[PDB]
Write an enzyme that holds these catalytic residues in place. Structure first.
Site: not given
Ligand SMILES: *Cc1c(COP(=O)(O)O)cnc(C)c1O
Ligand SMILES: O=C(O)CO/N=C1\C2=CC=CCC2=N\C1=C1/C(=O)N=C2CC=CC=C21
Ligand SMILES: O=C(O)CO/N=C1\C2=CC=CCC2=N\C1=C1/C(=O)N=C2CC=CC=C21
Ligand SMILES: O=C(O)CO/N=C1\C2=CC=CCC2=N\C1=C1/C(=O)N=C2CC=CC=C21
Ligand SMILES: O=C(O)CO/N=C1\C2=CC=CCC2=N\C1=C1/C(=O)N=C2CC=CC=C21
Ligand SMILES: O=C(O)CO/N=C1\C2=CC=CCC2=N\C1=C1/C(=O)N=C2CC=CC=C21
Ligand SMILES: O=C(O)CO/N=C1\C2=CC=CCC2=N\C1=C1/C(=O)N=C2CC=CC=C21
Ligand SMILES: *Cc1c(COP(=O)(O)O)cnc(C)c1O
Lengths: 809, 809
Positions: A349, A540-541, A648
């Site tokens: 990942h 996102k995080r 994602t």
């Molecule tokens: C889809 C999702 C992620 C991943 O988001 P990215 O922008 O790819 O890091 C993280 N947290 C939640 C709650 C999500 O629904």
């Protein structure tokens, strides 16, 4: 109400209503006079759950009869979110339940908000596991998700004084109606002890025993009557300094499944974490073998079993499988190894070094003595193979070793996974190529056949039908409902790009979603956004590689330009940033404070008006993502080229009508490729450009010296413009940006702001903005997790997906 | 099958069967192909529980409407045992369920054995609370039982190498179908902190908060459609050195309700125990006040609320009530005190000094600072009253103080209870008199009106109908079923004492019960008893005051007489002794080892044959008592005169057809008085005799010197006759018997063995033995807990019991 939500039959609604009242009475033990919204939510949940049991029992009974190859997806995270609406969608019960509750005088949407998110994940990796479960059931695969039932999931984020505060996520407080405890199937897991070498084989003795109690949750496929199982293990102390204290110390063993480590893409080598990893592996493998012996020649094991490792977290499955086959089943080493390799597959990942699991030898030595010996043996035999293929290449030997020498000896779990798996895959084309060209180049050269790519995907059930019914409906109106389980059909929408009616409907749905979210923002949290502005969101995080900081720089730039020319027209924007920071990640916590600090200045500047708003989305989680994504206009995917393996969230935004501004990183590359670069807002360095800069050496000072606007921003941060009472509050941020920025924020600044200007220009042309949106939605089909799972099935697990309805409930 | 078990209606059985299958499918989520006996037990339990909910809801709704005076029974123990059969009995569903399961091809008796005992008690005190709940519901009182939901009850006793081994009682492992968690009604409880004196009143601040989550269990009355509630509190940490560790440390707060202290009649001053005591009191009182404010002049509080303290364990209710009324409600002291006294009543359970709760001041000082101040104030005002009534009697002042001076200052909780209660009662006439003449003489002289007697009782539902259906049936045949809720009617059986048919039936039932138990002994535990012998049993907690040792001496005497004259005829006996020892009670643990050691010698001596067997009944608990008591011929109630406050096991044996050999102690006195001394086997010193011996000084050596048979026994113990490999194994026992026996075992030895000879003589005459049995059963009516509760209701709580059926379900 809306077509795609199913039929509201007369018999169905009547039946739902009485079962609802039955559960309220017999299950919740309350009468209508004192029931609260939460009681009503549970009555509905139990009613919906009832519709699953029949199908769940026959599906499992079916796998027992036909005995197909089983797929075991091991993950320490399953970011499930809420289950009520998803279950109704997959069972075609949404309209029926909506009508039934309506007749009982209740608002189903109000009831859905009561459900607690099953937040057993940190972000991308955990959500992927969740979408995968949905797709595997939808494709009729005999799949089983295996993980840990944390009693505390990802922490709930509170913002106090602009700072992140963490509080326990007691998601089980009111109970979980979806799971079924199975105490009768509890299994033992061993820890510590020592290894004895007897006449015939090694023995692992004097171990501490911890029990693994399974809780099973049903995973329904989309309208195919298939219901698979997600089994989560819970730690229990066996019953065999004082009597009271002995009983109280039982909690030491049960702490194993107490809480989820809140780290996203970061390795923290704590013993408790290692225990969790072995705990899930040891219990799961006993189930696997158990189930196999029923369906003793283990030569057919790989034909009946496939184990997928979600990252290296469950990597101990490899030596644990060897331990069982060699020590217990008494198979010869080579035979056991052949079986193990053909059974296991590993999914990587990330390429960031701080995320790589490298466990200290002394830890494995004490906790899992037999596994360390097995690992040494695997390494020994593996290196003999490298030596034979590359005679004399001594440096290669040390680079490929599973054992890493140095300060403290460590075991590289990624190397362990590659050696013990018949397939290794990246999660996006560019990521998979980077693995073969850099990080795992040596392994790729030794065994090229093992390396594959399986671009990530998201489930269109939760990420379209469930969270954006309005959009799913207008799409269904023109092309039918078949696309729900065959996203590629969205292509057909390309022939509506010039259809004035469709253009108007697509824009109307987005407008409604924005009004809806703008309202939710005020109901809860009392804010002030303006529905007419461009919704610019990055959720996102919080990570330095994600570059929320680059976004912050753009925001400050916009603010400064407005203050420079107040009466100049600018496209109004509402910039939303949300995400959680790992508790021990100092820089990430400082970034959150910066965002809120910017909002404090910008949101109260009279001259700005409602032309620019900066909001930090508190407690970002799955249920929140379901609300904000459908309301977004612009999706920020701006990680430094080569750092985001796939992403994602980017796919979720694309499917929901937002345009994307991003770097050529991870899946962004394939998304732009599918929609056409002209329909994407690409900017910044490419992977090659980053490498060139690294050769030369990155000097942030250069950009600071040649870009007046950038210099002004840094000086504002430094002088306390955004922190009056604490002038040097953001010193660490400036220092990092100026002297040790691994992600080169400044290097992409100019191209980023210039690209943002092009976005504002297109937004001023509603019709053309929407037409570009349609071209993105129409080409998002490839990013369905159904496609991803179909590829894993055919190219890795060796099983054919099926869209056949199971013989009714 | 048998009349008293209800009707097996056609519609009823059909309905039960389908609901059984419904729960198996929807609740247990299994189909008939894989269901196990445990699954079947749960399907039945949920089916029976369903029949309660309707009545439970309307009963509680009824109390809300009519608003009667509420009775709150506070106890740290509720020794409930199994719930399935009891619920069926009280709902008149036993025959119906028996038929329904029979038709489904299942044996209901096999299913009942699967249920785990709710062992939330140690013995007498906890079982009394359980019988009381049953009687209060049967008498239609608006009563609420309040306690703690220990996740681990009384430990399961294992015998290894003849020694007691303790293992955790994980009674919740498979779930508890009877309880209903009510997380929405969770309340806060405070600990530690400090007291601040503000302008208007004292404030308790900077406290640590622990949440009390209630679990409610239904308590059905006997066929009157009344279903009361038993609410048990569970400790939960609030959600507000590291993030992980903070989450892990939550268990520190939840340990409060983790385990039951396994002490019977012994005070262990541990902080955790004090926390449990306040925890139950603090949460319970908030419910009480809450419920009262609904039904602010607290002058009517005593008219709407009655709080019964089961022993001093919940004594903190007194100062806690004062704290709430004075600190929170702002009532003046005198008003609050008047209310408190009229509301609280205290029940004393023993006069033994080691059982008295005397908490160190430094403990209350740290844990409950405000309560200690309130206690000092209560003491101050109470002593001013003593001083005014007995001018100059300075020694009286120190004897009556709630504060005990000395090594470490302690608070005498019994004195606290007497001062703050309008009624104080003993549990048997002789016990209540002893309280007034000795232990509480000073208090009795100051307030004679407060002292009462309420002789203990047992519920005839569980202790007759449920455990001995055979006997209940033959009784019902002659006098009807009315006695089930009016035990005094058993008198009418006196006119059948010469009825040859009845005599034969009574003896037949006893014989069947013995065969049944003799079989159970072999099924489980593989033993060898002979059904024709006299079943001599002593089951109760192991204690020196209980004198299991005196019983042991008799057993050894019988063994020695047989070895002396092998070919002499003696009435065959099976001596059964069972009971648990508190883990830290060394002497008690040695007594268990002695019993098993005696069995090892006696049970393998060829010359003895099947004329004498010594069996130790492992893991004695409620469910086991339900099996052995109906099978007993002789009940051993041989505590030293003046030590057993009442006893309740004695009553269970009397109601089930066993004759009693005992001392004039506790309720034995009233039992003999009811049946007639000629129908009882009384022996030994009376209370007066014990006092005379104490004046003179007890010298065990004297008895040893003048009784040859006794000397022989002690020498056998000393020389290792019962412990070959460990000759001095029982040195502590001999030493205790010879030099520091507080219970004077030797003093009653001669009269005891002589009395036992009279028992053997009567047993040789089957007809006369049975006729005496009939006279005991016929006069056991007074010992029904319905009589006891009726007296508490009228003489202490001020409420009238009702036998009116509640308006159907
Ligand atoms: C889809 C999702 C992620 C991943 O988001 P990215 O922008 O790819 O890091 C993280 N947290 C939640 C709650 C999500 O629904
Ligand atoms: O414990 C109490 O103080 C009240 O308990 N009440 C109930 C109660 C207690 C325990 C189980 C079920 C149950 N249902 C209850 C009620 C219900 O269903 N409807 C009403 C209306 C007004 C008061 C109470 C109720
Ligand atoms: O309908 C309501 O607002 C409250 O219904 N409350 C209850 C209630 C309703 C139905 C069954 C049981 C039951 N118990 C209840 C309570 C309890 O046990 N403790 C409290 C404290 C404050 C408010 C309410 C309760
Ligand atoms: O330098 C340090 O002492 C810590 O650097 N830490 C991190 C760190 C540095 C650079 C990039 C990412 C990153 N994540 C980091 C962490 C994370 O995600 N979780 C924790 C918990 C405790 C300490 C540190 C972290
Ligand atoms: O997980 C497995 O290996 C099997 O899971 N089986 C079941 C199963 C799993 C999860 C929920 C319900 C459930 N019922 C199940 C069964 C049932 O009701 N009857 C049979 C007969 C033979 C095999 C299996 C079953
Ligand atoms: O009927 C039986 O004897 C066993 O039914 N077993 C199961 C079973 C039956 C019905 C539903 C689910 C289900 N899970 C089951 C098992 C599981 O999850 N793990 C084990 C290990 C050994 C035996 C059985 C199981
Ligand atoms: O002398 C001592 O050190 C202890 O004497 N203990 C007891 C003791 C002495 C005399 C009569 C009864 C009695 N019960 C006793 C105990 C009990 O019931 N539970 C415990 C737990 C830990 C230590 C002691 C006890
Ligand atoms: C009734 C009972 C007791 C009390 O017995 P006594 O002989 O009065 O001490 C103790 N334990 C159990 C399990 C009981 O049923």
């Amino acid at each position: 109400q809306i077509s795609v939500r199913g039929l509201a039959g007369v018999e169905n609604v009547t039946e739902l209503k009485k079962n609802f009242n039955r559960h309220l009475h017999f299950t919740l033990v309350k009468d209508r006079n004192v029931a609260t919204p939460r009681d009503y939510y549970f009555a509905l949940a139990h009613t919906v759950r009832d519709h699953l049991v029949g199908r769940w029992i026959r599906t499992q009974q079916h796998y027992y009869e036909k005995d197909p190859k089983r797929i075991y997806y091991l993950s320490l995270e399953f970011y499930m979110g809420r289950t009520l609406q998803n279950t109704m969608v997959n069972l075609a019960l949404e309209n029926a339940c909506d009508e039934a509750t309506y007749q009982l005088g209740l608002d189903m949407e109000e009831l859905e908000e009561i459900e607690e998110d099953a937040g057993l994940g940190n972000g991308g990796l955990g959500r992927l596991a969740a979408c995968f479960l949905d797709s595997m059931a939808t494709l009729g695969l005999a799949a089983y998700g295996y993980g840990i039932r944390y009693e505390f999931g990802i922490f709930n984020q509170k913002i106090c004084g602009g700072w992140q505060m963490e509080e326990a996520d007691d998601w089980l407080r009111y109970g979980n109606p979806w799971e079924k405890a199975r105490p009768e199937f509890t299994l033992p897991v061993h820890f510590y002890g020592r290894v004895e070498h007897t006449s015939q084989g090694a023995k692992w003795v004097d171990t501490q025993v911890v029990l693994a109690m399974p809780y099973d949750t049903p995973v329904p496929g989309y309208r195919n009557n298939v219901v698979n199982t997600m089994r989560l293990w819970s730690a229990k102390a066996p019953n065999d300094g004082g009597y009271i204290q002995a009983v109280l110390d039982r909690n030491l063993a049960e702490n194993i499944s107490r809480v989820l480590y809140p780290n996203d893409n970061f390795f923290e080598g704590k013993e408790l974490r290692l225990k969790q990893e072995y705990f899930v592996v040891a219990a799961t493998l006993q189930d696997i073998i158990r189930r196999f012996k029923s369906s003793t020649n283990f030569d057919a094991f790989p034909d009946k079993v496939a184990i997928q490792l979600n990252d290296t977290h469950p990597s101990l499955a490899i030596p644990e499988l060897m331990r069982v086959l060699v020590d217990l089943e008494r198979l010869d080493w080579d035979k056991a190894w052949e079986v193990t390799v053909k059974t296991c597959a590993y999914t990587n990942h990330t390429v960031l070094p701080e995320a790589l699991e490298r466990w200290p030898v002394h830890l494995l030595e004490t906790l899992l003595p037999r596994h360390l010996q097995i690992i040494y043996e695997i390494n020994q035999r593996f290196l003999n193979r490298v030596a034979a293929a590359f005679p004399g290449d001594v440096d290669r030997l040390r680079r490929m070793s599973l054992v890493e020498e140095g300060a403290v000896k460590r075991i590289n779990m990624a190397h362990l996974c590659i050696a013990g798996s018949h397939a290794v895959n990246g999660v996006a084309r560019i990521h998979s190529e980077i693995l073969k060209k850099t990080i795992f180049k040596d392994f790729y050269e030794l065994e090229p056949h093992k390396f594959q790519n399986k671009t990530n995907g998201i489930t269109p059930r939760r990420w379209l039908v469930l969270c954006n019914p309005g959009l799913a409906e207008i799409i269904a109106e023109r092309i039918g409902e078949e696309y729900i389980s065959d996203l590629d059909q969205l292509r057909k929408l390309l022939s509506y790009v010039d259809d004035e009616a469709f253009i108007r409907d697509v824009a109307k749905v987005k407008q409604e979603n924005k009004l809806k979210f703008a309202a939710y923002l005020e109901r809860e949290y009392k804010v002030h956004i303006n529905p007419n502005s461009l919704f610019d969101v990055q959720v996102k995080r919080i990570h330095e590689y994600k570059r929320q900081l680059l976004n912050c720089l753009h925001v400050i730039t916009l603010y400064n330009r407005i203050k420079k020319e107040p009466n100049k027209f600018v496209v109004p924007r509402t910039v939303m940033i949300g995400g959680k920071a790992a508790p021990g990640y100092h820089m990430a916590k400082m970034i959150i404070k910066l965002i809120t600090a910017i909002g404090d200045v910008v949101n109260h500047d009279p001259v700005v008006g409602d032309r620019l708003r900066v909001i930090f989305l508190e407690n970002y989680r799955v249920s929140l993502a379901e609300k904000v994504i459908p309301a977004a206009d612009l999706s920020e995917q701006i990680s430094t080229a080569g750092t985001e393996a796939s992403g994602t969230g980017n796919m979720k935004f694309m499917l929901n009508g937002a345009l994307t501004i991003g770097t050529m990183d991870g899946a962004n590359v394939e998304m732009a490729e599918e929609a056409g670069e002209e329909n994407f807002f690409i900017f910044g360095m490419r992977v090659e450009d980053v490498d060139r800069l690294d050769q030369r050496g990155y000097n942030a000072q250069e950009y600071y010296d040649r870009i007046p606007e950038l210099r002004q921003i840094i000086e504002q941060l430094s002088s306390g413009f955004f922190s009056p009472k604490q002038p040097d509050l953001f010193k660490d941020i400036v220092n990092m940006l100026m002297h040790h920025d691994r992600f080169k924020v400044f290097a992409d600044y100019e191209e980023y702001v210039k690209c943002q200007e092009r976005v504002s220009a297109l937004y001023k042309n509603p019709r053309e903005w929407t037409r570009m949106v349609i071209r993105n939605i129409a080409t998002s089909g490839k990013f369905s997790s159904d496609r991803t799972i179909a590829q894993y099935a055919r190219e890795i697990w060796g099983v054919e997906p099926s869209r056949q309805r199971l013989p009714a409930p």
